Amino acid sequence: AMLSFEKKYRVRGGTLIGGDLFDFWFGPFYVGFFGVTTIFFVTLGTLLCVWGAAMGPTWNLWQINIAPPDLKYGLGLAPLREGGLWQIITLCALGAFGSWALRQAEIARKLGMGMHIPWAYGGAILAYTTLVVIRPFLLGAWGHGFPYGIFSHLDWVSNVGYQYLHFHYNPAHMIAVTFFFTNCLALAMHGSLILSVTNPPKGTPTGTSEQENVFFRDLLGYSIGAIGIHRLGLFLAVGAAVWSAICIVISGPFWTQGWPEWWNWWLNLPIWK
Amino acid sequence: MMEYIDGAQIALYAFWLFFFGLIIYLRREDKREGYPLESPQGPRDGWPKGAPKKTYVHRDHG
Amino acid sequence: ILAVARMGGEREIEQITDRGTAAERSMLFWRWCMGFNATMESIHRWAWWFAVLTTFTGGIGILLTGTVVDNWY
Amino acid sequence: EYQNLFTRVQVRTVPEPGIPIDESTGTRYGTGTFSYLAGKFGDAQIGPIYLGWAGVLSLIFGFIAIEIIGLN
Amino acid sequence: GMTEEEARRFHGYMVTGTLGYVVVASVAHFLAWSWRPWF
Amino acid sequence: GMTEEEARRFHGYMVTGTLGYVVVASVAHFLAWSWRPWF
Amino acid sequence: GMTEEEARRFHGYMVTGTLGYVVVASVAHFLAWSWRPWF
Amino acid sequence: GMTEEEARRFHGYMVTGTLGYVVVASVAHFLAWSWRPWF
Amino acid sequence: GMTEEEARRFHGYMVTGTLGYVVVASVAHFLAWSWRPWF
Amino acid sequence: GMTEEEARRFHGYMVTGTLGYVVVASVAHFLAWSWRPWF
Amino acid sequence: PVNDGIWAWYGIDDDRPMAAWSRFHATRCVEQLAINRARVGAAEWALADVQARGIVPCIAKAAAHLARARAELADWEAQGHRLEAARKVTPGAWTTPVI
Amino acid sequence: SDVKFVPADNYNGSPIIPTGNPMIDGVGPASWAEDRRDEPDLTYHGSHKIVPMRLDPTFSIAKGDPDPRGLPVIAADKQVAGTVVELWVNRSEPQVSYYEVQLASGERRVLLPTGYVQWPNFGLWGNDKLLVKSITAAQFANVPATKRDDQITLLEEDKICAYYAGGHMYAFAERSQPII
Amino acid sequence: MHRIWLMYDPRRVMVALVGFLAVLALVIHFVLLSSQRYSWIENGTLGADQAPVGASAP
């Protein structure tokens, strides 16, 4: 089916690879060449996840756990029961996430939009690629990746944190947390302002950009404007993921002690050493 | 006394019932524009059925 | 919104009251990407509820801790 | 392709908003001003704030809270 | 939309494929049953 | 939408299919009870 | 919107469906009770 | 679009390709069963 | 797109590249088998 | 853009360069095999 | 500085008043003369338009803007004359005149 | 024909093919919201929101930014399209909304939305010409007109923005094709 | 009390009622299934005197 205004927009063009061959829709979904590759990697990766569950101890959704190999295998592919299945699924996930980004570019090109969405999603792909590729590769073993399991990856996060005794003291982590918290605040403010001028109390005219700028101005002391709040939201949300990737890649490859003792440089500034 | 049922489990299902109710509400709101859908088989609503298209009253100025 | 800002998509109140091609393209992008879409108004409700539920579910979890459950593991 | 990430041409207006929409009781504090740096990323006006009775008391109560923490 | 003649014509193939599939599945079950019965 | 006459025609199929399904499920429960009773 | 006639006709089916439902629930509860009473 | 003659011509290739592929798979299973049977 | 006579000419090269590739692979497999059989 | 004549000229270089690279790489393998053979 | 921008941090500044010959300052001057003459042309067109539609406070600003555009042009014409004088006395300078 | 496009074929989910010039007819990325209200957008106090800066004496360019007036506009085919002669400002949120360009040929003035203008070095220096990647200098002649020279309707804002949005696909026949 | 169907659209009320009953029945069945006394899938064949009971006052 189509939105009442949609049909006019469904032209050919804007593809990156396939030309007209895959330039069609399936229900609501645009396909394209990277749609085909997406569904390939999604299906293969999903069915291998189901196989991992089948050969594991339970079907309980929360307890399924497909673990990476032991560190002794280094950068080789382990036996599939022993973590090689995790390594294949990781390749499928990279293939799927990459295909999804490039498919979004084909869609943006067909609509004459800017490329912002593909790149903003690249911030998440960067963070994933850091956790499963870049950081494991710098540590010299694929076994440093997180396990694929709804709670077992939380056991990994816990243990990686305490590998540095008190992970809250990681300075890039403090920045990343600040971005996540500031983003959620900014999202609530922006959502509230737009809804408050479009849904004023009954018997009140629809509001205006002037009213939301006046309200925003006496909240923060300055008016950010309509383009400004969207630039800020993009900056905060994507900046959180980028600082997240930094905070985890410095932990291990570049810093090995507890994080609290990193702050020794601040105590030793010569003005007060 | 109930061994398995506990107050954290009860509270969690209360949230799930609310949250699915919320998703239904949000999907009705998502359908105020562009619906009903055009199709070869005639108009289509999906599910849930969208809320009606909303009229906005502008101000008389001063 | 930045991707449609050149078409006036950042004038969100007017895109809500007087839908332009910037809103239509925004709806079609997400529809064609993931099979469903919001509206220029209703995306701000998704935004509002996600932010609000962060701290609301948080508070419930704190209140349950040490009063109903003493060991979450 | 222009990314729309920062504003290469700002415009000033000599009279200004910042004088609020019709608001009744309380007082508008300060005069509006423009920051060129604010104008690069967002709207340039840094300007007047409203408190009323609840805003004044909130700052008094909050300042004391901040003083007690810092002094300790 | 389909003519009722076209619906009639499609329904013959649809029943025949369903029957064929059910036969193949029935043979598959009886092979599985002969090798390792589940009751 | 439907006329009342079309609604009446559909109701015949719907009730018959519903009752047919319940009969098939009734035989399934007969077989299951005879294999391993739950009370 | 319903006429008051359609409302009053629909109400008759609704009362009847409710009664049929409460009857089945009553039998179900008495089957449950005689198998394993809760008071 | 494509005509019923084009559809019929394509179908003949499509059925043949499927059956040839199934034949090749059959010989692969014959070889694998000779090497290490699974029942 | 291309005409049928173009498609025939392209197919002639594509088939020959496929046979060439398969021949190199066949020698590669027989070298590997000679070195270290997998059955 | 391109022509039969232009394509032929480039193809001559592209084939020659590719084969030249493979020749130099085969001498590197000869040197590596002499230093420390892998089978 | 709008023209040299970031390069003003490293002391490239081809806008500054120059009386010796300099091909960089002459290049900047030739570019800015064309832009400012177009800008004066647009300013006096805008005055003619707003005079025709008669709005008094807008006519005042359009005339004030035009005067500023003429003054900013006159500075570049002065720069052009300095460089053109220096061109004639300096070996290896341009053969095409500034201004 | 009074239909702007036709299906590429009979199958579900097939693309449409424009029957004429898509940039002019408004198909694909050149489309606008054709039922959009043909009235000016208004400020809180009820005046016209978007106006030529010539008609609001409170506005001016900020200190330290280039004045775009008098700059040449360089189109997608590297030809000069024209010169900027005026700015249109949004009065509810002070912005330049459109550049008004005196065309080098045929002496139309056309509007150019600021979201389609790139400054030469991301604006870090130079700042002496405007780059318009979306359309060629010839295509500037067909930018949709504004039925008055001192106001713009919400419908006209959609037509103009849609015309440049279509250029990223239709300005050259190659722009529809893949990169491989 | 049929004017309730003038007050509320019966198409909406009847879907509300179906959803309410579906949720409530599922809640009650899963509560009972999580008990000891009524864990009927494991223990439904026990006689009424053999079924579990919670502890008394001492």
Added chain:
Amino acid sequence: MHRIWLMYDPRRVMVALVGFLAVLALVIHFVLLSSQRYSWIENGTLGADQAPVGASAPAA
């Protein structure tokens, strides 16, 4: 008293009332089901003399 229905739309009130009553009923049942004395699913067959009681004053 009936002019309360002129202040308040009964179509809103009946929904708000049903919502309140359903929440309140579920809250009370689950509070009782969590108690010792009234965990009736597991202990409902106990006689009133043998149902649990909270401990009396400890003479501390």
Added chain:
Amino acid sequence: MHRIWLMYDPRRVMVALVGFLAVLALVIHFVLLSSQRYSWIENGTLGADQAPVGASAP
């Protein structure tokens, strides 16, 4: 009764109903396959008196 199909589009209800029955059947089967007594894949060949039973009262 047939006037219910004037209140609800039968094309929509049939899709809804097949969706409900598919989910419900999968839920019931997975509840049983989780259980001890009805793990029929592992223990379905046991006689009815050999199949597991939950604990009685002592």
Added chain:
Amino acid sequence: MHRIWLMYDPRRVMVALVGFLAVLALVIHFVLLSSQRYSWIENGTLGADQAPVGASAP
């Protein structure tokens, strides 16, 4: 019974059916392959008397 294909487009029903049967078939095979008794890749050559049986009641 063919007028079911007037209420529903066969092109859509066959997509839904192929999707449903694909998922259901893969579910059942992986469930069996996860079991002890029907782990046929490891144990398919055991006879019926040799295959596992889940623990009986005492």
Added chain:
Amino acid sequence: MHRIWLMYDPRRVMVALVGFLAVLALVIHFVLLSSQRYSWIENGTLGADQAPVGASAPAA
């Protein structure tokens, strides 16, 4: 039977078919290569009298 190609575009049924077969073939190979009995890269040279067979524990 051939009118299935008037219902569906053969150009993309063939894409969906080939992709399904590629995904299926890769799954079955990775499943077999995960097993002990059919881990053919490591043990393919074992004769059928030496190949692994899985059993349950006796637990007598």
Added chain:
Amino acid sequence: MHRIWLMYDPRRVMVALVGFLAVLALVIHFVLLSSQRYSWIENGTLGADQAPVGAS
């Protein structure tokens, strides 16, 4: 079978096929490279009777 190219214009799908083959070859090599029996970089010189077998 040449009519296949009238469905699938080769200039749009050769880079598809070649991308498929290159990734598949790399996967197969890496699967072999870290098996015990075929880790030829470390053990390629052994000869077949000395090469590992992953017997249970």
Added chain:
Amino acid sequence: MHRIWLMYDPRRVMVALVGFLAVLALVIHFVLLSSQRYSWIENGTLGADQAPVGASAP
């Protein structure tokens, strides 16, 4: 065979080829450098008899 260059822009193919071969060379060197037998920066001076070999079959 040269008509392949009428399908594909050599300016882009030569970039794609050189990129591919550069990545491939860099991978093969890193695989060898990470090995035991061919970690030539540390052990390159060892004679071919002295160079490491992986374990045989026990």
